[PDB]
Design a protein around this ligand. Structure first.
Ligand SMILES: [Mg+2]
Ligand SMILES: [Mg+2]
Ligand SMILES: [Mg+2]
Ligand SMILES: [Mg+2]
Ligand SMILES: [Mg+2]
Ligand SMILES: [Mg+2]
Ligand SMILES: [Mg+2]
Ligand SMILES: [Mg+2]
Ligand SMILES: [Mg+2]
Ligand SMILES: [Mg+2]
Ligand SMILES: [Mg+2]
Ligand SMILES: [Mg+2]
Ligand SMILES: [Mg+2]
Ligand SMILES: [Mg+2]
Ligand SMILES: [Mg+2]
Ligand SMILES: [Mg+2]
Ligand SMILES: [Mg+2]
Ligand SMILES: [Mg+2]
Ligand SMILES: [Mg+2]
Ligand SMILES: [Mg+2]
Ligand SMILES: [Mg+2]
Ligand SMILES: [Mg+2]
Ligand SMILES: [Mg+2]
Ligand SMILES: [Mg+2]
Ligand SMILES: [Mg+2]
Ligand SMILES: [Mg+2]
Ligand SMILES: [Mg+2]
Ligand SMILES: [Mg+2]
Ligand SMILES: [Mg+2]
Lengths: 48, 153, 394, 63
RNA sequence: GAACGUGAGCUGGGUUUAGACCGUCGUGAGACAGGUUAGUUUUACCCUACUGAUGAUGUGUUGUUGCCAUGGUAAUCCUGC
RNA sequence: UCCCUACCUACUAUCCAGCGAAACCACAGCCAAGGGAACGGGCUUGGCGGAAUCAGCGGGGAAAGAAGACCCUGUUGAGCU
RNA sequence: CUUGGUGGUAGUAGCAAAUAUUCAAACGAGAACUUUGAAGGCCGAAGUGGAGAAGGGUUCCAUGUGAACAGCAGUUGAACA
C-alpha cells in the first residue's frame, strides 16, 4: 500500500542507507500496521 | 426543462443530458455526426472499436492538418482519427440514458438515437511562459452535451 | 543580367512527369505496321529478370584494334517460359481513333488467368465465364461465333491476341497470372485470323518468336528509390560549408517579374518507378531449360562447344532472390531496366537495323557460373571437392 | 584465357575478377582480392597462414 | 536583358555607424569622392505559385483489357585510317 | 576545402494518444498586353475555370518588423568649442 | 482612439539540453508513471552525497481528501482540510 515511512525508520535504526533494507513482500499488511519504532525493533527480533 | 427540439411522441422517447465536460469540443462534433442515425447496439460496439483503432471517424469540418487513413473509405472520405477520450464520455451518457428509459417503461432493443447536439461552455484558463518576459494564455475548450432517444425497430 | 559562364542544363524536360505509374507492367505503346512480305509472326513477349553474369567471346570486326581477341561482356538472364493463347479481339480504324470491335474468348480458361479478374479469391465463388462458355456447347452459340468471325473478315483491319503467362511453374509466391495483348504482323487479315484460330488455346514458346543475334527493344519499370531531394534527383551542385540553412539545395529558382516559377526548375519529389524503354539489346543466346528424357532429366544448359562440361547456368546456391532456373531463357548484353523478379516486356525493333555491328555473329567460349553471394572462387562443386578434399562432417 | 594463379593464396584465378599489380622493377603480380593485397603490402609471410596452400604443403597435409 | 534578374537563397571583402592609427586643413570642437586594421545579417505554420500524393462528377453497381483529343520533346561535335 | 559526390549513426521533423499557443488579417486571392500616380489581384479586350484535402518548397503578395537614424524644412532642443 | 467581449489563422506550430529501462505481486472502480521485491544502468567523493551561512517563514511530521493546480495522467505531492 505505502511503506516508504517504514523503510525510512528502518534505515535510521540500523544506521545505514535504506538502499540496503530488505523487506518481506509477503507480509505487507503486517508491516503496514507498524507506525512505531519499538514495534519495529520487535519486527527485527522477529526476523522479517 | 426546455430542450431545443421537442420529441414527437413523449411516450416513445426518453431524455438525457450532461453539463461542463472537460473534452475537446471539435473532436466530439464529428464523432457525434457519424453515430447520429445509427442503432444504439451498433454504436456501443462501434465506440469500443474506436478505442482499438479498428473503425475510424471521418473528420469533415474540423479538418485542418488531419492525416489520412484507410478505414474512412467506408464513409466516403480520407481523413479519420481514433479519438479515445471523446468515446469514453458519451458511453457513460448512453448507460445513464438507457437506465432512465427503463423507469419510463420501454423496450431497449428498439431505441434509435434521433438527436444529438453540442454547445460550447465557459472556458477555463491557465498560462504559459514565453521569451522576453511574455505571458500568453493557455485555454481549455469544454463542451455541453444533450441527446434524445426514440423507439424505432 | 546575363549569366557569366554559360553551362548546359541538368536533366530533360521530356520526361518530367516524374510520377508513380498506375501500371506496373509496361504497355507496348505502338507496335509496327505489318507487311505481307513476311509470313505471319508475333511482335512481342513476356520475360522475368533473374540476375546477371559474365561472358567471354572472340570478336571479329575488321578495322578495329581488338580484332581476333577474347573480350568479356556482361549479360542478363530473362526467363521467358511459354505463353498460352486464349482470345482474339478486333479493331476498326476510324478518323477518331481505333475502336475495339468485338472480343472473342475461348471455352476453357485456366484458374491462373481467372485469378486476375478477382480482388479476393478465397472469398469469391469463382463463377467467371460460366454462362459464356455455353456458346461453345450449343448450335446457336457457335453460330453467333461464326457471324462474329465473318464480320471480322470484312470490316476489321487489325488483330491482337490475348496470351497469359504460366505463373504456376515458377517459384515465385504470386500465382496471379499476367494477361497481355500481342499484335500479329504478317500477311492478310484472313490468313492472320485462320492462324490464330488454329493456335487458339495453345502453348507458345520463344524459339518460335525470336532468334539469336537479334536487336530488341526492352520495356519495363525502373527500380524505385523513394523520396530523394533535388540534388540526387536532378544532380545539381552542392553548396559550400558556410551556409546557415542547408546546402543540398538550389539557391535561386527564378526571377521577379515572371512572377510565377517555371516548370523547368528542379524541385523535390519522387525518383524512379518511371516507365522506360531501352533499345538495341542483342540476344546472345537462347538456352534451353530443364526437360526429362530417358527417365532422367538433361539439365546441362551451359555446356558449350569448347568446354563440354555438364554445368548449367544455375550458379552455386541459386540465383539471389529468385530460385531455380528450369525454363528457357535469353542472355542479353549489358544491363536492362528493372530489379529482380521483375517482369520485362520484350519487343521487336521498329527500325530496320542494318549495320556492321547489328549483323555481327556471336560464338560463345565461356559462361561463368561462380557464386554471386560473395567472392566465389569455384566454377563447380567437384572442382571444389578436389581442391579442398574430404571434410570433417563426412 | 591463361587462368593465372594467385601469387599469395595459391588459388586459380578466373578471368574476370582479380587485380594485377605491375611494379617498377618488373615482377607482375596477380591478386585475387584485397585480403591478399593487404597482406602482401604488409609483407606477412604466407607460409605461416593456415588457409593458404603453402601451409598445408609445408606441413605435408593431404596425400 | 529580365526591379543594372536573383539577401525570410548564402556570403559580408568593400562602401556605410560606435573604438583607434597617419598626412594635410582648421587657434579649437572637428573635417577629407585621401590611405589603414577589428566590428549581432530576424520570422513562414497563411494565400497563391511549383513539386510530387490521395481523391472528386457522369455511364444502375463493379472489375477488365484497351483507344488518344491535348500538353511536353534531344541529342551534340571532334580526332585518326 | 575542391574535381564529385556517396554511405552510415543518434536527436528530430513524419503518423498516432493526451494536452494546446501567438505574431498577422479592408474584401478577397489563375495570366499576357493596353491605357492609368508613367511596373494592376479586381478595370477594358483577350487567354480560361471543376469538390475537399497531405508532405515539401521559398517566385510573388512592392509580405511581417519599427510614425526613416542618412538628406531637407523647422524662426524645435540638448552635448561640446 | 479607450475599456470590455469574440473570430479566422489552429485542434496546427509544438511538449528534442546532459545513455534506460524491463518482469511479477498488492491496495484500488480504473494504473506506462503509486509502493514492495526481483533484474539491468548512471552520478563515480573538484558528487545528483552528508552538513551550515545570508535569505525564505511553517513549506517540517502524521491522517484524510481527491473540486481546482503540478502545460499527458496520477490511488501521489512542497496543492487542499
Ligand atoms: Mg480550414
Ligand atoms: Mg501540413
Ligand atoms: Mg516555455
Ligand atoms: Mg552569354
Ligand atoms: Mg552565416
Ligand atoms: Mg549482387
Ligand atoms: Mg536589383
Ligand atoms: Mg538578410
Ligand atoms: Mg529576394
Ligand atoms: Mg571600410
Ligand atoms: Mg595645427
Ligand atoms: Mg504533341
Ligand atoms: Mg498524442
Ligand atoms: Mg494588391
Ligand atoms: Mg514569397
Ligand atoms: Mg518583397
Ligand atoms: Mg520616428
Ligand atoms: Mg517620421
Ligand atoms: Mg517649421
Ligand atoms: Mg522662415
Ligand atoms: Mg540651445
Ligand atoms: Mg508539422
Ligand atoms: Mg504532431
Ligand atoms: Mg529543452
Ligand atoms: Mg538526452
Ligand atoms: Mg560519467
Ligand atoms: Mg540532508
Ligand atoms: Mg515536509
Ligand atoms: Mg502523466
Amino acid at each position: 500500500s505505502m511503506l516508504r515511512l517504514q523503510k525510512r525508520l528502518a534505515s535510521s535504526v540500523l544506521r545505514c542507507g535504506k538502499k540496503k533494507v530488505w523487506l518481506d513482500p509477503n507480509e505487507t499488511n503486517e508491516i503496514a500496521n507498524a507506525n512505531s519504532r519499538q514495534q519495529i525493533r520487535k519486527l527485527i527480533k522477529d526476523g522479517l | 426543462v426546455r430542450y431545443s427540439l421537442d420529441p414527437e411522441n413523449p411516450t416513445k422517447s426518453c431524455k438525457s443530458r450532461g453539463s461542463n465536460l472537460r473534452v475537446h469540443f471539435k473532436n466530439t462534433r464529428e464523432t457525434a455526426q457519424a453515430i447520429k442515425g445509427m442503432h444504439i447496439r451498433k454504436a456501443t460496439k462501434y465506440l469500443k472499436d474506436v478505442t482499438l483503432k479498428k473503425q475510424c471517424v471521418p473528420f469533415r469540418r474540423y479538418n485542418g492538418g488531419v492525416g489520412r487513413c484507410a478505414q474512412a473509405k467506408q464513409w466516403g472520405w480520407t481523413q479519420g482519427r481514433w479519438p479515445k477520450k471523446s468515446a469514453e464520455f458519451l458511453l457513460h451518457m448512453l448507460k445513464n440514458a438507457e437506465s432512465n428509459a427503463e423507469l419510463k417503461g420501454l423496450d431497449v432493443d428498439s431505441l434509435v438515437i434521433e438527436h444529438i447536439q453540442v454547445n460550447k461552455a465557459p472556458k477555463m484558463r491557465r498560462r504559459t511562459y514565453r521569451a522576453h518576459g511574455r505571458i500568453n494564455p493557455y485555454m481549455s475548450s469544454p463542451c455541453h452535451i444533450e441527446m434524445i432517444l426514440t423507439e424505432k425497430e | 543580367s546575363h549569366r557569366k559562364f554559360s553551362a548546359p542544363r541538368h536533366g530533360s524536360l521530356g520526361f518530367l512527369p516524374r510520377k508513380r505509374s498506375s501500371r506496373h507492367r509496361g504497355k507496348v505503346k505502338s507496335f509496327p505496321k505489318d507487311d505481307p512480305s513476311k509470313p505471319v509472326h508475333l511482335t512481342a513477349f513476356l520475360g522475368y529478370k533473374a540476375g546477371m553474369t559474365h561472358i567471354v567471346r572472340e570478336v571479329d570486326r575488321p578495322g578495329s584494334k581488338v580484332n581476333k581477341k577474347e573480350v568479356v561482356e556482361a549479360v542478363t538472364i530473362v526467363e521467358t517460359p511459354p505463353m498460352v493463347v486464349v482470345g482474339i479481339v478486333g479493331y476498326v480504324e476510324t478518323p477518331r481513333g481505333l475502336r475495339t470491335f468485338k472480343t472473342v474468348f475461348a471455352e476453357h480458361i485456366s484458374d491462373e488467368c481467372k485469378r486476375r479478374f478477382y480482388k479476393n479469391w478465397h472469398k469469391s465463388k469463382k463463377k467467371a465465364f460460366t454462362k459464356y462458355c455455353k456458346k461453345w456447347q450449343d448450335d446457336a452459340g457457335k453460330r453467333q461465333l461464326d457471324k462474329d468471325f465473318s464480320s471480322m473478315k470484312k470490316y476489321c483491319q487489325v488483330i491482337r491476341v490475348l496470351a497469359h503467362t504460366q505463373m504456376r511453374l515458377l517459384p515465385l509466391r504470386q500465382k496471379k497470372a499476367h494477361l497481355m495483348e500481342i499484335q500479329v504482323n504478317g500477311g492478310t487479315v484472313a490468313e492472320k485470323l485462320d492462324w490464330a484460330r488454329e493456335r487458339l488455346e495453345q502453348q507458345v514458346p520463344v524459339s518460335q518468336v525470336f532468334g539469336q543475334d537479334e536487336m530488341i527493344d526492352v520495356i519495363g519499370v525502373t527500380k524505385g528509390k523513394g523520396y530523394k531531394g533535388v540534388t540526387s534527383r536532378w544532380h545539381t551542385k552542392k553548396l559550400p560549408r558556410k551556409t546557415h540553412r542547408g546546402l543540398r539545395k538550389v539557391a535561386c529558382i527564378g526571377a521577379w517579374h515572371p512572377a510565377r516559377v517555371a516548370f523547368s526548375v528542379a524541385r523535390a519529389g519522387q525518383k524512379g518507378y518511371h516507365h522506360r524503354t531501352e533499345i538495341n539489346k542483342k540476344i546472345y543466346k537462347i538456352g534451353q531449360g530443364y526437360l526429362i528424357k530417358d527417365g532422367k532429366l538433361i539439365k546441362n544448359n551451359a555446356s558449350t562447344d569448347y568446354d563440354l562440361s555438364d554445368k548449367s547456368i544455375n550458379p552455386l546456391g541459386g540465383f539471389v532472390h529468385y530460385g531455380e532456373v528450369t525454363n528457357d531463357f535469353v542472355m542479353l548484353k549489358g544491363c536492362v531496366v528493372g530489379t529482380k523478379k521483375r517482369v520485362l516486356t520484350l519487343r521487336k525493333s521498329l527500325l530496320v537495323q542494318t549495320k556492321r555491328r547489328a549483323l555481327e555473329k556471336i560464338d560463345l567460349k565461356f559462361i561463368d557460373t561462380t557464386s554471386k553471394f560473395g567472392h566465389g572462387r569455384f566454377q563447380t562443386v567437384e572442382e571444389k571437392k578436389a581442391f579442398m578434399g574430404p571434410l570433417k562432417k563426412d | 584465357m591463361k587462368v593465372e594463379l594467385c601469387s599469395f593464396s595459391g588459388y586459380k584465378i578466373y578471368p574476370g575478377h582479380g587485380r594485377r599489380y605491375a611494379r617498377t622493377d618488373g615482377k607482375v603480380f596477380q591478386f585475387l582480392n584485397a585480403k591478399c593485397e593487404s597482406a602482401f603490402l604488409s609483407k606477412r609471410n604466407p607460409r605461416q597462414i593456415n588457409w593458404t596452400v603453402l601451409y598445408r604443403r609445408k606441413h605435408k597435409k593431404g596425400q
